[PDB]
Amino acid sequence: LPFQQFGRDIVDTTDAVRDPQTLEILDITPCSFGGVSVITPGTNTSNQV
């Protein structure tokens, strides 16, 4: 709506914004992340992982 500036999801986290100059609606998504798992055989067998 013309009077609305930001946006929030169900858990009250910003996920949209209006550009101050061009007045465009831009989506915001966090950059990727995750865990790291290492698969190895017995260390007395080899050193490849």
């Binding site: 999801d9 169900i10 858990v11 986290t13 966090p30 992340f33």
Partner: peptide, 27 residues
């Protein structure tokens, strides 16, 4: 099991899987 269905599930299992229905974001 019903061979016609691509998932190879019995009709009762199909109804059981369709009955249960499961947010899912904001990592």
């Amino acid at each position: 099991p019903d061979p016609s269905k691509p998932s190879k599930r019995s009709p009762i299992e199909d109804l059981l899987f369709n009955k249960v229905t499961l947010c899912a974001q904001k990592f």
